[PDB]
Amino acid sequence: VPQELIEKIKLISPGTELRKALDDIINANFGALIFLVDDPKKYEDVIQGGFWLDTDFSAEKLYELSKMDGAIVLSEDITKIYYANVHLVPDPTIPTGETGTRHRTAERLAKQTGKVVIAVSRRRNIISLYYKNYKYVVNQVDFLISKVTQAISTLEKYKDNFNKLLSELEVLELENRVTLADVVRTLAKGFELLRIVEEIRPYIVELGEEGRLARMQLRELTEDVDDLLVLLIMDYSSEEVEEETAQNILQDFITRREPSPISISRVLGYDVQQAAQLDDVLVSARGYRLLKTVARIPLSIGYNVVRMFKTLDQISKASVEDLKKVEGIGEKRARAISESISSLKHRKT
Amino acid sequence: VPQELIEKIKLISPGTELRKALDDIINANFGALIFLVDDPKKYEDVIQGGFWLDTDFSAEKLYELSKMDGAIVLSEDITKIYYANVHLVPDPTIPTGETGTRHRTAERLAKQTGKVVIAVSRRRNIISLYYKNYKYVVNQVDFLISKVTQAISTLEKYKDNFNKLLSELEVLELENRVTLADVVRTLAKGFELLRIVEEIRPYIVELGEEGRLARMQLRELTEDVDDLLVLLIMDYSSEEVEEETAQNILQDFITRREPSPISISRVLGYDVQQAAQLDDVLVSARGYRLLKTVARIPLSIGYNVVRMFKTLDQISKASVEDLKKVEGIGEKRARAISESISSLKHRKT
Amino acid sequence: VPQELIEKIKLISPGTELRKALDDIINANFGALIFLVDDPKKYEDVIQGGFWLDTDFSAEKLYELSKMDGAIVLSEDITKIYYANVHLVPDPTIPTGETGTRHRTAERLAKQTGKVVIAVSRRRNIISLYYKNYKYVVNQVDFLISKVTQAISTLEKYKDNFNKLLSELEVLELENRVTLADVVRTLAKGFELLRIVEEIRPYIVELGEEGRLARMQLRELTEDVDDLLVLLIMDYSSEEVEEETAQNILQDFITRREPSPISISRVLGYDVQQAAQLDDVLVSARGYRLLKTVARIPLSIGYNVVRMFKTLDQISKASVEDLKKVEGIGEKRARAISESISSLKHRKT
Amino acid sequence: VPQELIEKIKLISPGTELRKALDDIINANFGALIFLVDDPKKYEDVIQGGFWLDTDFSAEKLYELSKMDGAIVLSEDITKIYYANVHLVPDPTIPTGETGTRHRTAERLAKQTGKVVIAVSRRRNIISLYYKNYKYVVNQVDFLISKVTQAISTLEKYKDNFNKLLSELEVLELENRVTLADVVRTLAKGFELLRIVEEIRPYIVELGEEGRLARMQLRELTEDVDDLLVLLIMDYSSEEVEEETAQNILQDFITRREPSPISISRVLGYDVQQAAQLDDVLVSARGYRLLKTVARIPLSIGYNVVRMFKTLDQISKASVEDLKKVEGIGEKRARAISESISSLKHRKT
């Protein structure tokens, strides 16, 4: 959805004065045809009759004016009401796939002028926004909340399964018994979880102010998921991979590519044919995930540790003395690494 | 519910153009009587007057036409609108249990012609679909979402209890202190959980496109439950049982038979009279569940392991050398089996 | 709420044909005044004019008849429609606190005849049922579902807190460091949880068929809570207490008495003044809870074990030989008791 | 929101007879203009015509009277209905930002008389309450329940994350490996959780009787959170801090100040510049949290223990003999402290 169009959508999103007025118009079953222009004098060819108002905008004024037949003309920033009860006359030759005089008029005028035109039928509760060659149907909050609440509840389920796969993989990592199947399975669920987030995003935006709690819920649920997926990619990719490259891997599986077993294993650098082979491939974590998230060791410094010990397994066997031989690790970071790992092994395994 | 009827239901399920039109008809309180035929010329005996249109179908056209009294005649694939404002005259002698001219007309015409007839009253919000001798009442999405959301919330509860019973049984299995009561109790909850899924299924289908999130939620919640139940049956049945036979046991308790303690113990091969005897019967897991789900050993190969060690208890005491004496188990699978079991015992017990 | 009245409520609960008709009447904004009698000939003094029908009842017939002014007279079992469009004339001297002719008429007639009278106003969506001197207002399903869904969600919260208190008490029990405060705190939450269940019960009943999922949810959530509370009472009461007596203690705190710290400690047999003293009183579990729920030892036999070992602490130190000296405990039950306890200590502590 | 205004809001909150009447007025689309005064005789200058009633108030009476045009005059405590169908004539010169005769009249009269004036338009479902220079818009229960249910669901998410941070910090505390980052992160989530509670509070109040379940849910979810945050502040502040001072720290971050890392660390007494330095600062718990919440040692006595051992780490190494050297700790409290700590270390680490 183009950004130039997303900007216009904000104009009638829950929270704005304009939307408050449109909600009331809908509740009263009045119809509405609103034309947003900047220079009223320049549309004497498409705007006919009505009353010249040139007054300050307000939700109550718009509502009251919508009681009359015809269209209302507002300024682009919704600060002035220019005309009311006007007859809009766009070029009849302009193609339109709309039905009815009001919507056909709205699409034609928007295409002809490159301006925003809002239409509301008397019987229905949707707001149709036309801008240039675009058409966006805005829904009432109740419909949006139902979809968003369902999506969140769905996300909770995926997240619960992600957490179980993660704790299981954690045990396998600490014991160095991880297979490519385990890794890919965890990444797959992580990619599916973030995809759901991406798909509900437009619903959230459209909710405007009414989407505050929904946003907070999405944040609490998916907080550090992205980072976690990036660290897993770095820890299990066939060959050393830069963080940015890992983040790009993530972005691709979250939008373009499809998170299938073989496909994920393929992008990780493993030449696998059948998904049954995944259980056959053994892999050892580099150690980034634990070093950063648990030992609180910056990636730039974690590279150094991996460069020397190569795997988490070796890192877990290294003494403080051993660890201090690494650039960037003093008695403090050496203790943190050593202690955080020995603590997890004892508690988890 | 016959499949030939489920096909017709899809025609007016959320997502289709036809349903979009019917939703609008309902919202406007217009009534509707739609007849779906393939060869319009062949019904001159039941179709009278009106206007011959023979035009391409669209939701807006259907809606506009429903403003007139009478019936609308569409093509079976909903691509053409043949007539509008017609008088439908089915045989008056045909039996009908419907009330009112419109619904009695619809049921008679559907029975007389073997075709689909859709009726909508002006005052109510349900869609009545008649086909041959069938009648299916389709509900609005809001009603369906309420029932489905409740069922899912209910499933979450059953699943939480299933998970607790499973972790408890896991401890008992690793310690070899399982009784027939423990097994049957876990299977019972598992059968009750899947039954709920089966009962909400028609609601999900009827939701059409609006049932996407609901489906994803059901999948995340019951993902590997079926497999798990089949493996339990294989591990605790009185005598060795094939997977297919286990899957058939599952299908029966999920639809036909009732998951009562004694009944489940009976089908497992145990001659028990009172449910109080279940706590008295000791049983030892064959080992399939752990071998497949944890060691990732294919059932065909797990049979071999069980054939030799007979029980999970013995399998847990076998060394890698011991395990490698089995056909299909090399140093890799022997390690996986041995390590995965010793890890669970240490962590869980 | 009297049972004789609960019986009449069932007549118009979701699921019945009568309620289906009333729902439609409400949806159409028609009013309704229904009189349920067994012998129509015997009310010529309160029933005037209208049409004598004496026909079989059906939802559609009732609905159609409600289009006329006046009242409808049905048979008590809702199988016949006796009159329609009648004028009901109860004694004007009978006291009534209702407003409007229809509701004042309904209450007077119900009091005068001891029969059921149902009233529905044209503008509102509630069903008012009058029977003798009772009046019950039945609500639409949507209102009931909202309250019930909220209550269940609330129960989930109390249950989560109950579970945390229980696992904490479990640790304390296995270690024999329980104080009267710990016990009372757990019982209090358990009494509050079951009370909520008792308060939502009428809402559930009133939901009729539409309350199936709600019931299943309440069952899964509070399944073995009652038993658990009874066993705790038996394990921590100051002096040995019979099961029935424990169940009566439970029933009282779930309805009559208020679950306050001191009050619960008082009824347990402990003479405590301030709630601050609770942390000062040390108590040792008899062992019933663990013996029955974990070792699967019947209470009649558990009494024997307690009679000899006195406390769970001693029971946990007893060998199989020691345990077998008890009446009712053989090598099987001795092993179960010994093994189940040693397993919990190892896993939990 | 001023308390003098909150008092007036209660007058029309769900549960009151007045609100029951207003809900009905709204459902019937009747309008309403209600004036609440104590001495009717004293407003002959703003009250004109209508009917003098001087009768007892009831919901049905108010409803019936609202069918007439004009205003209704009630007594301040809602016990009497003084006038009906009156013309209200407040001073036209008084400033008003309202639209329409009814709302402009209501705001003017409330400002002019310092009394409560309630306005309801025929088309909308909100109740507008005017009092002196205040204006409060009351919403229907369905709107409030949706917001409250969302907020609670959001709180559940924050609480789940708080619990995970707490268990993680618990491990770090028992092992004495806590950094200022860990502490601040936990406090931040705790401050964000309580803030949400504070923001939903007005919605809860406005729900009146319909907010009972909502309140119970908020209580179960945030039960001992405040105490826990206060104890953390006491355990990790740079210098010894009194409980009251800790509670004041809490109140500030829950309303005035913003819970940002550096800001929280700053108020704790640590001179930190960048949030990256937090991971660099090591801190040791005083021991209050564990002493009070786990050992059940009063803060007044816990001060003594800390005064001597200084840190939880030292407290965990102290023998019963060592602990008994402290004022206020006998064999009982010494055992509780020693045993509760050794139990946590064994179970958690």
Ligand SMILES: Nc1ncnc2c1ncn2[C@@H]1O[C@@H]2COP(=O)(O)O[C@H]3[C@@H](O)[C@H](n4cnc5c(N)ncnc54)O[C@@H]3COP(=O)(O)O[C@H]2[C@H]1O
């Ligand atoms: N060129 C044409 N071709 C065929 N029929 C025509 C027509 N012009 C007017 N009508 C018929 O008259 C109806 C009502 O016209 P009206 O101006 O009151 O009431 C109108 C008007 O207030 C507004 N509206 C529609 N087009 C407009 C425009 N170009 N400019 C300003 N307002 C418009 O929307 C209302 C409803 O529109 P709707 O089509 O549902 O309803 C239309 C339509 O059935």
Ligand SMILES: Nc1ncnc2c1ncn2[C@@H]1O[C@@H]2COP(=O)(O)O[C@H]3[C@@H](O)[C@H](n4cnc5c(N)ncnc54)O[C@@H]3COP(=O)(O)O[C@H]2[C@H]1O
């Ligand atoms: N054979 C008969 N016996 C008794 N009464 C008769 C009748 N034929 C017509 N009516 C009376 O006239 C009403 C309205 O007829 P209408 O054609 O406008 O309005 C009709 C019509 O547009 C449509 N409809 C019903 N039957 C139809 C049919 N066989 N073919 C096409 N349209 C039909 O449904 C609308 C409402 O039907 P509804 O029964 O509620 O309402 C009926 C009914 O009360």
Ligand SMILES: Nc1ncnc2c1ncn2[C@@H]1O[C@@H]2COP(=O)(O)O[C@H]3[C@@H](O)[C@H](n4cnc5c(N)ncnc54)O[C@@H]3COP(=O)(O)O[C@H]2[C@H]1O
């Ligand atoms: N004794 C009386 N005193 C004062 N006013 C009187 C009255 N009798 C009749 N009315 C006035 O006439 C209105 C409509 O009478 P209606 O019979 O059409 O329409 C009635 C009638 O169909 C039904 N209904 C009420 N009482 C009934 C009864 N005793 N028997 C059968 N039907 C009754 O409920 C409808 C609405 O009742 P509602 O009171 O709202 O509306 C009443 C009321 O304002």
Ligand SMILES: Nc1ncnc2c1ncn2[C@@H]1O[C@@H]2COP(=O)(O)O[C@H]3[C@@H](O)[C@H](n4cnc5c(N)ncnc54)O[C@@H]3COP(=O)(O)O[C@H]2[C@H]1O
């Ligand atoms: N001074 C004035 N300036 C301009 N127009 C005037 C006016 N006085 C009356 N009207 C016009 O008459 C309409 C209806 O008057 P009404 O008394 O029936 O019906 C009224 C009345 O029952 C009530 N209401 C409004 N102001 C009131 C007041 N000061 N005292 C008592 N009742 C009032 O609210 C109803 C609707 O008010 P609404 O303004 O929507 O509708 C008003 C308005 O369009």
